[PDB]
Design a protein around this ligand. Structure first.
Ligand SMILES: Nc1ncnc2c1ncn2[C@@H]1O[C@H](COP(=O)(O)OP(=O)(O)OP(=O)(O)O)[C@@H](O)[C@H]1O
Ligand SMILES: Nc1ncnc2c1ncn2[C@@H]1O[C@H](COP(=O)(O)OP(=O)(O)OP(=O)(O)O)[C@@H](O)[C@H]1O
Length: 464
């Protein structure tokens, strides 16, 4: 039938880096593996070397997914290549990923990059290969697409290899976890929950064995070798705001659109309290980021107005601001000059948001996207905000920092408005869901599972 992959003590060096030293690749046919590990450690390189067959791989049909070309070809046609059944399947996969009939029959040239990535995703799902490899497939999808993709991949019967830092996705889809650590692959049977249990237990026991080793060495001296394990203590805690008299923040009769385009919102009324937990949902391109920018005041309404308490302090996150910052300063200098922080305070703040010590003295322009995002979260902490407004906060974070962010949101005594595709984050923070639709915002009275069933019921899909 189908062969397994067992490549033992292979090594991969790429871009002048020793990414894999004597690693073992075990991929059993039919199982679903999630590949997790820190940024820049060689996950994408491993997938590319498997697809290339640069590593000795048996002749199984293997597909690695990447962005699809832009031409006059209609989207279901780039999927497609009896025929009625195949076209219906392609259109079902496309609708699940957020394609309405028009977008379906739309030429692939009139789509942005992310939508072309979705088109390619539909392709590899349609082809149904023996071994399908997905590189962070939910990272740039919206919540509706992630809901559908999770539900779809649970019924997948062939072999999957998925790189991801989407914890709920990994928990719902994967039967095995592969951890890229110390240039090697470590295997865990079960989803991410099982992996984190086993890994934290391994680290506790390594610490105890190191301590007993050093105690016995001291005893020998008074009368191969192990190293001390490494800590990784992220704490995303935000300071709790003092009491604030209403009104807090609201849009009143707000109409907004961009020049020469049909307005994205008409006669919009939407307000928050100091305990609000709001998750803005809707397919990409509907205006979620625009709504957040209207809530911050960085976009001015065409009609109506935004009103907030004149003492309200907003902490705002989005990826484009992370590329803004103050590029020639170090993160330490950035925090100290922005908020008159003593050096030790800036250091502890940068450290607890996940910025390693060696990066505190690098110019911000030389930092990676994840490092810049962590600097922005630290800045938000220093701003002492009353309202957190987070547009896709998890895109450049690891799972441990996303868990820390969820815990911090649950401890935070201010308001939080978030746009996110991370189901675990949206769920654990008890977010009330508000969908952008009808040039307005509509409340989903119900929990996240109600919205998930609603999304799948609109598509004629059976929730597993
Ligand atoms: N085109 C390139 N040129 C130079 N260096 C690269 C290139 N691609 C990757 N690298 C380096 O190789 C290392 C591993 O890259 P890779 O992208 O495989 O890691 P990854 O973060 O696990 O992958 P991904 O984030 O794409 O899932 C990183 O240090 C990265 O900077
Ligand atoms: N500066 C701009 N000028 C003209 N049109 C814009 C501009 N910014 C966004 N748009 C358009 O407005 C529509 C909605 O944009 P927006 O990014 O707010 O929605 P979104 O995809 O839900 O948010 P996100 O960017 O967080 O995914 C899109 O069709 C987009 O092309």
């Amino acid at each position: 039938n189908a062969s397994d992959i067992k490549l033992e003590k292979f090594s991969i060096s790429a871009h002048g880096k020793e990414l894999f030293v004597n690693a073992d690749l075990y991929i059993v046919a039919g199982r679903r593996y999630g590949l997790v590990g820190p940024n820049g450690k060689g996950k994408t390189t491993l997938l590319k070397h498997i697809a290339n067959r640069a590593l000795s791989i048996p002749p199984n049909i293997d597909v690695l997914l990447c962005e699809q070309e832009v031409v006059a070809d209609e989207t279901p046609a780039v999927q497609a290549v009896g025929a009625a059944a195949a076209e219906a399947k392609a259109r079902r996969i496309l609708a699940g990923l957020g394609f309405d009939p028009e977008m379906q029959n739309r030429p692939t040239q009139k789509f942005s990059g992310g939508w072309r990535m979705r088109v390619s995703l539909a392709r590899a799902l349609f082809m149904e290969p023996t071994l399908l490899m997905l590189d962070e497939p939910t990272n740039h999808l919206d919540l509706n697409a992630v809901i559908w993709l999770n539900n779809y991949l649970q019924g997948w019967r062939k072999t999957l290899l998925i790189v991801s830092h989407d914890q709920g996705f990994l928990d719902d889809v994967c039967t095995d976890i592969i951890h890229l650590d110390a240039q090697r692959l470590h295997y865990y049977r079960g989803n991410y929950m099982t992996f984190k249990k086993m890994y934290q237990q391994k680290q506790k026991e390594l610490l105890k064995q190191y301590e007993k080793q050093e105690k016995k060495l001291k005893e020998l001296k008074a009368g191969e070798l192990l190293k001390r394990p490494k800590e990784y203590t992220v704490r995303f805690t935000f300071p709790d705001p003092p009491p604030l008299s209403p009104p807090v923040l609201g849009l009143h009769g707000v109409t907004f659109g961009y020049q020469g385009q049909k307005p994205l919102f008409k006669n919009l009324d939407f307000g928050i309290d100091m305990d609000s937990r709001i998750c803005i949902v809707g397919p990409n391109g509907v205006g979620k980021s625009t709504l957040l920018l209207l809530l911050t005041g960085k976009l001015t309404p065409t009609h109506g107005e935004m009103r907030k308490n004149h003492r309200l302090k907003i902490g705002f996150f989005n990826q484009q601001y992370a590329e803004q910052l103050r590029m020639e300063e170090t993160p330490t200098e950035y925090l100290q000059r922005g908020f008159n922080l003593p050096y030790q305070d800036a250091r502890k703040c940068l450290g607890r948001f996940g910025l390693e010590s060696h990066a505190h003295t690098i110019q911000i322009c030389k930092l990676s996207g994840g490092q810049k995002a962590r600097v922005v979260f630290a800045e938000l902490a220093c701003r002492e905000p009353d309202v957190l407004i987070l547009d896709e906060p998890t895109n450049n974070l690891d799972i441990e920092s996303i868990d820390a962010l969820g815990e911090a949101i649950n401890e935070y005594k201010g308001a939080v408005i978030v746009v996110s595709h991370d189901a675990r984050l949206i769920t654990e923070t008890n977010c009330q869901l508000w969908v952008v639709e009808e040039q307005s915002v509509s409340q989903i009275d119900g929990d996240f599972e109600d919205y998930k069933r609603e999304v799948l019921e609109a598509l004629g899909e059976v929730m597993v």
